[PDB]
Amino acid sequence: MFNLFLAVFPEIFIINATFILLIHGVVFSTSKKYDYPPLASNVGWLGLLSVLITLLLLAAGAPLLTIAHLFWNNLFRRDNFTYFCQIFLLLSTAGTISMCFDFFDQERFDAFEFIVLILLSTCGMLFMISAYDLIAMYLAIELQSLCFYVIAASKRKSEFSTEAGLKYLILGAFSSGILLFGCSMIYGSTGATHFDQLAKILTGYEITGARSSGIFMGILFIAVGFLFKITAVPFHMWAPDIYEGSPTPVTAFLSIAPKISIFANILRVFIYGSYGATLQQIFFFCSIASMILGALAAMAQTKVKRLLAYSSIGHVGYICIGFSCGTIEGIQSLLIGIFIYALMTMDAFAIVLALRQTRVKYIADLGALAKTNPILAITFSITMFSYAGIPPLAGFCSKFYLFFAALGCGAYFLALVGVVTSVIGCFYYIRLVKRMFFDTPRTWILYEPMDRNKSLLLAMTSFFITLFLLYPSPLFSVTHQMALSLYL
Amino acid sequence: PKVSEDKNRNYAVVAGVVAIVGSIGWYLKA
Amino acid sequence: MDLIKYFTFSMIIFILGIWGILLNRRNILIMLMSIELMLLAVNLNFLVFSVSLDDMMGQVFALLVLTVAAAESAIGLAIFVITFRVRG
Amino acid sequence: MNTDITALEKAQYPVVDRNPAFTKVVGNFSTLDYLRFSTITGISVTVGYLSGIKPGIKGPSMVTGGLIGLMGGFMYAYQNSAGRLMGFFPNDGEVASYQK
Amino acid sequence: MILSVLSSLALVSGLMVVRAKNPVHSVLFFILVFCDTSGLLLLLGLDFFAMIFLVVYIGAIAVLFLFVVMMFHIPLLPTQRNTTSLRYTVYAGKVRSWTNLETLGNLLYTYYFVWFLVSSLILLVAMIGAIVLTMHRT
Amino acid sequence: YIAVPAEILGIILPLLLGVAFLVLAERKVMAFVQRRKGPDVVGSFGLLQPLADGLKLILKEPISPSSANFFLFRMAPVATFMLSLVAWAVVPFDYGMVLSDLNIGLLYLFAISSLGVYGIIIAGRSSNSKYAFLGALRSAAQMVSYEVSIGLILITVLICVGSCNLSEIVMAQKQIWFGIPLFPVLVMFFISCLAETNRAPFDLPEAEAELVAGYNVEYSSMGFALFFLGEYANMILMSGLCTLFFLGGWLPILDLPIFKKIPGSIWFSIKVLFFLFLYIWVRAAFPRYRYDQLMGLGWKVFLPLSLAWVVSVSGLLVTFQWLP
Amino acid sequence: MMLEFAPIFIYLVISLLVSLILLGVPFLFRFDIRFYLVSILFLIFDLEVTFFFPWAVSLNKIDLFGFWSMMAFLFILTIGFLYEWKRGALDW
Amino acid sequence: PVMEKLRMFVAQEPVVAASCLIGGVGLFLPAVVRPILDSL
Ligand SMILES: CCCCC/C=C/C/C=C/C/C=C/C/C=C/CCCC(=O)O[C@H](COC(=O)CCCCCCCCCCCCCCCCC)COP(=O)(O)O[C@H]1[C@H](O)[C@H](O)[C@@H](O)[C@H](O)[C@H]1O
Ligand SMILES: CCCCCCCCCCCCCCCCCC(=O)O[C@@H](COC(=O)CCCCCCCCCCCCCCC)COP(=O)(O)OCC[N+](C)(C)C
């Protein structure tokens, strides 16, 4: 009876710790004895400890978590792919929550509900990766969606935060409605909400032999909703505004934690529920458009957060290249690109949060940064080059293997567009470089020193980026095992 | 000048000592 | 033929909600009603499909969708009243 | 309810009490399980104390961290003990205990 | 013919929702849309959902919207000559026939109980979010 | 199938005259509690007094400019009155003395009660006043708040019987009423029905709405009286709900097979009028309750306690396998 | 089994007619947040009632599992309501 | 000891203490009494 729950401890524990943190915060934030203490950093440290403990629980249950798989079959199906995806998403969440501690006390934002909502959205993401049915898929999407709608509008003094939160709300609600309408007809035309039986009724007959106007258009609507979820061009109506308006730690959690889970979800849907080979076309054109428009639009931006938003869109296109070529190498390149992009995004947002102590807004404020803090300047330049794809760094390997996967399937146009978009993409990255090493403005902005957690995370990520090409075997082997575990 | 007199901080110190001892035993026994 | 009528009515409600949310970029109130209309149309799709196939996975998920609809409406009006406090 | 606890990937190691009761696996805790439980609880208590000095809540933070650490360490020890009895873990001790 | 007029009136109300002149009348037609929808579900044979639509949509969501608005201002061909007499009724299964409520509750809380707890977590997210944003308490 | 309208009129007209005589009973009982007689001159014992009141109200000039869109103000009384009547289409008087035989008929009652909030809201809004609308809104918030306690108590009742059908609920009370074990739950349900109709010490919202304004709004002569009629019909309905659920709906109270001459149709009416007498007694025995503490009470002493009662009933029934 | 709603429809039509004939007799002769908060709490604690309704009726069929799942649901909403209580937003 | 604080809490909040007591009874009956009567 109780031992049938050995496969859900990494989630039951995080829920219980979330409840304990919420209770402790609400009890001791209104105590007159301590005079309404600012227990946001306390709740944040306890939440980081809880995330570490549930990561330890998840890591040591590799032989476990596959028991009572018949009992849990209707609800979720977790396997080697799900195990690694969860163990990486939880690490990303831990890093994000760790690098935002100074944000709580530097600008006096002691709202512990931020941390509990991070934790609960992370629980929703952990549900999403294990989700193996349309209903659980949609519910796990909605958990993180509502958590982020609440969190984005948390800072209720700036017109950017509120308007960005409202735009995110409306766009996410429309995307969720589109996706749910898509799932409704796939249920209607076949029954069989479960993924296991959805991958068996559609494999029997190809879409070319006979045309089913329900399943095809439901699959199309599901794909459209998912592309809205990851903000893939042309479904990028407000994403730069969302990333600019939202608070910096929120945007740090976004574009890493949500995208990983949504991409795992899209992998599960694409591999099983798609046998008509009609999602190759929708991913093809949309990824090409994302590549081109991200490369051509990030060069015209003068702020920092908008540039990171458009770089995220471009990297989403680069990763989506892997969906068009459906092979083991394509999925391997996709997952490796996701991993490298997650590390580089964490490093870049650590940079942005570091200069947030003095309210950095534009790209010209970080002028002559090689004089005040040379080592931070070097770190930022290295991270920017890693974004660019320069060979002697991580990020070049991901683009390399994505191009290899694209050429493996004979999508020769994908390789050419990838090359040209990379060529333009590196240009404005180097443009960012010039204003930060070479030309010195008349007025210099002075940045106060950083704290230990952000510095440690930044140093670890910087040494990972530079020295990745020396020893990349473990990542490649993890990714090859994960790609094959979708079937066996 | 013989007792710490802070019965709350003492528990933290003994808990930290227990944590260090447990970590060492974990490293050795396993 | 009543399944066809049901599906067409729900689809027209769906496209009408899309129509409502697309036109007025500023009302911010008609958008929430249009989103509710979209959710309503999808709920009717699920329930009608469940009745036709004599399968229960349609009504369970339709009932669960109401929690999402209510939560989205609550958060939407919270953000709306926060936004309105700035102006006027 | 109909419950069937059958892992997709079978245990590579000898299995004893394929469906162990809660009381027995709690009673199967070895010295390593107690050590890891203790170190997890101690780390959690220390973090709770250290973090909650700036807000001023030094004791309540200790209690909250202690509760979190107790729950996490107990879950970890139970998982290890179960996986030992289920046969997923090296379990070289109670396989010998079973024979006698 | 009951389905046609009800669907048409619901469609008209839904159309007037999005092209309304003032938010009050928009919400008023928004209520009528769900009234007609619940009637349609009642015709479909699902009495439980038809009344949950009153309890939730025009019981709490419509009241919430109105509160906010108050302040802050292949088909088978119709030939049926020889089909109304070709209905084969299997009497087995009519004995001990459950309703729309017993059947739903049989498997909502027992087999698919994870999704139920996920919906609970969604409700908790909504409850927390409505408080963090809007507590001025000045 | 043409027999239905006769039943509809037979349910409607006695309800209206019963509302009139319930107003008369209110006046008479409050008079007797205060050592008075009340209306005695008209008729024999005041029995013709409501008729004189009605003929007087009709024979007066109607103040109906409505100072507004001319539509929403005339639809609010219609909506509240039709709702307070349609809530009566499911009550199982004795055995076949029920108009509609809904297989749920209880979630239906909850839905109908919850829908009876828009009437007062649009009455307040349509009545262009800066305080009448606000008072109507506070009253709506009060009813909305006590609806959840009503629903939890309904769930408590529904757990024991096991089926939503109202007739089966009374059928399940052959052994005992459900009022003997659930007496705290019965008190809670009485207080919630008392506070959800603004007919109690839980009254202040509307009481101050007239004190500070004097109802200097578009006050129709007897078009406004439909609110009063609907409120008293709701009084009668929520008086009968308590004797449907917690008391025996029509079963004899404490009876040996001797007093079998009388039918079950009056066993229901006697309990209904007893609960109405209790309503009048509570009104003329307690002082009014402030809205500041009204909301706090309704949210902090009834929701947690009713939830605890739900939990306890469910746990006790499950433990000993006493479920239906 | 569901023909018993046409009587409700006819009753509603006749009640509307009676309301009309009752209203026609003489003719023939600024913002508060607390309101939003109470509405939100009502919505949240009304969804739980809509979830309770299938649980109570079918509670016999499900023993010691559906009951405990509903208890977990209640515990989650009780944690939510406890956070609601201490933070304020519940008194005036 | 905890008894003084618990009793002071019960004195100040009667409804909350009563609700907790009845809920604890209703949760203790099926979690403790039920297994021991299951085994007769
Ligand atoms: C030739 C040389 C050869 C080599 C000689 C070898 C010698 C071996 C020496 C080992 C030293 C161990 C070092 C481990 C150090 C750990 C970190 C120190 C932790 C510590 O702040 O102290 C206690 C707390 O307590 C624990 O939070 C948790 C307690 C953790 C620390 C307890 C360690 C006690 C171990 C006792 C072992 C006895 C060993 C005896 C050695 C002597 C034998 C002769 C005092 O807190 P507190 O509130 O007054 O103040 C703190 C403190 O100021 C800062 O952390 C913050 O700024 C402030 O906010 C506040 O948090
Ligand atoms: C059991 C099921 C779970 C129950 C909890 C679930 C809900 C979560 C609630 C978590 C928050 C609860 C936090 C309050 C608990 C009581 C707080 C407390 O005990 O502290 C007391 C007293 O506490 C103590 O003194 C010692 C308590 C800590 C020592 C024990 C550490 C915990 C060890 C492990 C935890 C227990 C074992 C695991 C559970 C069985 C107050 O002391 P101070 O006021 O800080 O001292 C004076 C401060 N000043 C100088 C400024 C005036």
CA-wise closest residue to A317 among A239, A409, A394: A239
How far apart CA G72 and CA G34 sit, in angstroms, is: 29
How far apart CA D91 and CA D16 sit, in angstroms, is: 10
Instruction: Name the minimum distance, in Å, from the CA of A312 to any CA of chain C.
Output: 26
Q: Is B9 in the pocket of ligand 1 (CB under 6 A)?
A: yes
The answer to whether A162 touches C82, Cβ cutoff 8 Å, is yes
Give the structural domain span for G14: 5-87
Main-chain phi, psi angles of D8, to 5 degrees: -65, -45
Instruction: Say if E138 is an interface residue toward chain G (CB within 8 Å).
Output: no
Size of interface A-G (CB pairs under 8 A): 14
DSSP per-residue string spanning chain G: --GGGHHHHHHHHHHHHHHHHHHTHHHH----HHHHHHHHHHHHHHHHHHHHHHHHHTTTTS-SSHHHHHHHHHHHHHHHHHHHHHHSSS--
Q: A295: which 2 tokens?
A: 């490369």
When CB atoms are compared, the residue of D32, D35, D62 closest to B11 is D62
How far apart CA A343 and CA E41 sit, in angstroms, is: 50
The answer to whether F137 touches F121, Cβ cutoff 8 Å, is yes
Tell me if G92 is assigned to some domain: no
CA-wise closest residue to A408 among A479, A325, A477, A483: A325
Asked if F touches A (at least 3 Cβ pairs < 8 angstroms), the answer reads: no
Deposited experimental method: cryo-EM
> Distances in Å between the alpha carbon of F116 and those of A61, F76, F82, F112, F197?
54, 10, 10, 7, 10
Among left, alpha and beta (phi > 0; psi -120 to 50; other), residue A463 is alpha
* Tokens 């009545």 found at: F127
Question: From the CA of D65, how far away is ligand 2's center (Å)?
Answer: 9
Q: What is the fold of E2-133?
A: Four Helix Bundle (Hemerythrin (Met), subunit A) (1.20.120)
Question: From the CA of A17, how far away is ligand 1's center (Å)?
Answer: 28
Tell me if G65 is assigned to some domain: yes
Task: Report the 10 Å Cβ neighbour count for B17.
Answer: 12
Side chain identity at residue F252, one-letter code: P
Burial of residue A438, with CB atoms counted within 10 A of its CB: 0-12 exposed, 13-18 middle, 19 or more buried = exposed
Which chain C residues are closer than 8 Å to G50 by Cβ? 66
The pick from B13, B14, B24 for probing ligand 1's pocket by mutation, whose C-beta has the most ligand atoms within 8 angstroms, reads: B13
Q: Is B12 in the pocket of ligand 1 (CB under 6 A)?
A: yes
Q: Output the CA torsion F33→F38→F43→F44 (10° steps).
A: 40
Long-range contacts of C7-13 (CB under 8 A, 24+ apart): C7/A188, C7/C45, C7/C48, C9/C44, C9/E7, C9/E10, C9/E11, C9/E40, C10/C41, C10/C42, C10/C44, C10/C45, C10/C48, C11/C41, C12/E11, C13/C37, C13/C38, C13/C40, C13/C41, C13/C44, C13/E10, C13/E11, C13/E14
Q: Delimit the domains of chain C by residue range.
A: 2-86
Q: H29: which 2 tokens?
A: 């009956």
* Tokens 């969906």 found at: A323
How far apart CA A311 and CA A352 sit, in angstroms, is: 14
* Tokens 């409120």 found at: F231
Burial of residue E68, with CB atoms counted within 10 A of its CB: 0-12 exposed, 13-18 middle, 19 or more buried = buried
Main-chain phi, psi angles of E133, to 5 degrees: -75, -45
Find the distance separating the first CA and the last CA of chain B, reported in whole Å: 42
The pick from D50, D62, D70 for probing ligand 2's pocket by mutation, whose C-beta has the most ligand atoms within 8 angstroms, reads: D62
Question: From the CA of D63, how far away is ligand 2's center (Å)?
Answer: 4
When CB atoms are compared, the residue of C42, C53, C60 closest to A177 is C42
Rounded to 10 deg, the angle between the F225-245 and G6-23 helix axes is 150
Side chain identity at residue A83, one-letter code: Y
Instruction: Quote the radius of gyration of chain E (alpha carbons, Å).
Output: 21
Residues 6+ apart with CB under 8 A from A63: D9, D11, D83, D88, D89
Instruction: Name the minimum distance, in Å, from the CA of E29 to any CA of chain A.
Output: 21
Measured on CA atoms in the order F38, F40, F44, F46, is the torsion positive or negative? negative
Tell me if G32 is assigned to some domain: yes
Q: CA triplet F106, F161, F172: central angle to 5 degrees? A: 105
Helix (H, G, I), strand (E, B) or coil at E91: coil
Task: Report the 10 Å Cβ neighbour count for F165.
Answer: 19
Residues 6+ apart with CB under 8 A from A387: A311, A315, A344, A348, A395, A425, A429
When CB atoms are compared, the residue of A74, A136, A150 closest to E129 is A150
Residue E77: DSSP 8-state: P
* Tokens 């709603």 found at: G5
The answer to whether F301 touches F146, Cβ cutoff 8 Å, is no
Residue D87: DSSP 8-state: T
Residue of F nearest to H24 (CA): F312
* Tokens 């096991």 found at: F162
Side chain identity at residue A428, one-letter code: Y
Helix (H, G, I), strand (E, B) or coil at C26: coil
Cross-strand bridge partners of residue A194: A133
Find the distance separating the first CA and the last CA of chain D, reported in whole Å: 35
The answer to whether G77 touches G44, Cβ cutoff 8 Å, is yes
How far apart CA E67 and CA C73 sit, in angstroms, is: 13
The answer to whether A341 touches A244, Cβ cutoff 8 Å, is no
How far apart CA A273 and CA F235 sit, in angstroms, is: 57
Q: A324: which 2 tokens?
A: 């068009």
The answer to whether H30 touches G59, Cβ cutoff 8 Å, is no
Instruction: Say if A47 is an interface residue toward chain C (CB within 8 Å).
Output: no
Q: F4: which 2 tokens?
A: 């239905």
CA-wise closest residue to A317 among A168, A418, A223: A418
The class of domain C2-86 in CATH terms is mainly alpha
CA-wise closest residue to D79 among A3, A91, A68: A3
Cross-strand bridge partners of residue A362: A303
When CB atoms are compared, the residue of G31, G40, G50 closest to C74 is G40
Main-chain phi, psi angles of G87, to 5 degrees: -65, -20
Q: Which of residues 18-37 of C touch G (CB under 8 A)?
A: none
HEC sequence for chain F = CCCHHHHHHHHHHHHHHHHHHHHHHHHHHHHHHCCCCCCCCCCCCCCCHHHHHHHHHHCCCCCCCCCCCCCHHHHHHHHHHHHHHHCCCCCCCCCCCCCCCCCCCCHHHHHHHHHCCHHHHHHHHHCCCCCHHHHHHHHHHHHHHHHHHHHHHHHHHHHHHCCCCHHHHHHCCCCCCCCCCCHHHHHHHHHHHHHCCCCCCCCHHHHHHHHCCCCCCCCCCCCCHHHHHHHHHHHHHHHHHHHHHCCCCCCCCCCCCCCCCCCHHHHHHHHHHHHHHHHHHHHCCCCCCCHHHHHHHHHHCCHHHHHHHHHHHHHHHHHCCCCC
- Resolution, in Å, please? 3.7
CA-wise closest residue to A145 among A112, A168, A126: A168
Number of residues assigned to chain A: 488
> The domain that contains G70 carries what CATH number?
1.20.58.1610
How far apart CA A72 and CA A76 sit, in angstroms, is: 6
Residues 6+ apart with CB under 8 A from A3: A67, A68, D5, D19, D20, D22, D82, D86
How far apart CA A449 and CA G40 sit, in angstroms, is: 44
How far apart CA F321 and CA F314 sit, in angstroms, is: 11
How far apart CA F5 and CA F26 sit, in angstroms, is: 31
Q: Output the CA torsion F117→F118→F119→F122 (10° steps).
A: 130
Nearest CA to ligand 2 atom 43: D59
DSSP per-residue string spanning D47-64: HHHHHTTSSS--HHHHHH
Element at E125 (helix H, strand E): helix E113-134
HEC sequence for chain A = CHHHHCCCHHHHHHHHHHHHHHHHHHHHCCCCCCCCCCCHHHHHHHHHHHHHHHHHHHHCCCCCCCCCCCCCCCCECCCHHHHHHHHHHHHHHHHHHHCCHHHHHHCCCCCCHHHHHHHHHHHHHHHHHHECEHHHHHHHHHHHHHHHHHHHCCCCCCHHHHHHHHHHHHHHHHHHHHHHHHHHHHHHHHCCCEHHHHHHHCCCCCCCCCCCHHHHHHHHHHHHHHHHHCCCCCCCCCHHHHHHHCCHHHHHHCCCHHHHHHHHHHHHHHHHHCCCCCHHHHHHHHHHHHHHHHHHHHCCCCECHHHHHHHHHHHHHHHHHHHHCCCHHHHHHHHHHHHHHHHHHHHHHHHHHHHHHHCCCECCCCCCHHHHCHHHHHHHHHHHHHHHCCCCCCCHHHHHHHHHHHHHCCCHHHHHHHHHHHHHHHHHHHHHHHHHHCCCCCCCCCCCCCCHHHHHHHHHHHHHHHHHHHCCHHHHHHHHHHHHCCCC
User: How many domains in chain G?
Assistant: 1
Q: Cβ–Cβ of C63/E108 closer than 8 Å?
A: yes
CA-wise closest residue to A71 among A126, A127, A4: A4
How far apart CA F13 and CA G14 sit, in angstroms, is: 12
Question: From the CA of A32, how far away is ligand 2's center (Å)?
Answer: 17
The subunits that touch chain B, with at least 3 C-beta pairs less than 8 Å apart, are D
Q: F45: which 2 tokens?
A: 């014992």
The answer to whether A152 touches A139, Cβ cutoff 8 Å, is no
CA-wise closest residue to F235 among F269, F195, F207: F195
Cross-strand bridge partners of residue D62: none
The answer to whether G51 touches G73, Cβ cutoff 8 Å, is yes
Residues 6+ apart with CB under 8 A from F104: E47, E48, E51, E99, E101, F164, F165
The subunits that touch chain D, with at least 3 C-beta pairs less than 8 Å apart, are A, B
Residue C25: DSSP 8-state: S
Burial of residue A470, with CB atoms counted within 10 A of its CB: 0-12 exposed, 13-18 middle, 19 or more buried = exposed
Q: Is D36 in the pocket of ligand 2 (CB under 6 A)?
A: no
How far apart CA D3 and CA A1 sit, in angstroms, is: 7
Instruction: Say if E124 is an interface residue toward chain F (CB within 8 Å).
Output: no
Q: Cis omega (within 30 of 0) on the bond before H30? A: no
DSSP per-residue string spanning E12-48: HHHHHHHT-SSHHHHHHHHHHHHHHHHHHHHHHT-HH
The answer to whether A133 touches A115, Cβ cutoff 8 Å, is no
Q: Cβ–Cβ of E126/C70 closer than 8 Å?
A: yes
CA-wise closest residue to F152 among F117, F110, F108: F110
Element at H35 (helix H, strand E): helix H34-38
Task: Report the 10 Å Cβ neighbour count for F5.
Answer: 13
Question: From the CA of A27, how far away is ligand 2's center (Å)?
Answer: 12
How far apart CA A372 and CA F110 sit, in angstroms, is: 69
> Distances in Å between the alpha carbon of D37 and those of A59, A61, B15, D41, G37?
16, 16, 12, 6, 43
> Distances in Å between the alpha carbon of A3 and those of A319, D27, D78, E79, E110?
39, 15, 10, 59, 17
Question: From the CA of D59, how far away is ligand 2's center (Å)?
Answer: 6
Q: Is D59 in the pocket of ligand 2 (CB under 6 A)?
A: yes
Residues 6+ apart with CB under 8 A from H21: none
CA-wise closest residue to A317 among A296, A301, A343, A302: A296
How far apart CA F209 and CA F294 sit, in angstroms, is: 16
Size of interface F-H (CB pairs under 8 A): 46
Element at B5 (helix H, strand E): none
Q: B28: which 2 tokens?
A: 């050795």
Instruction: Say if A63 is an interface residue toward chain D (CB within 8 Å).
Output: yes
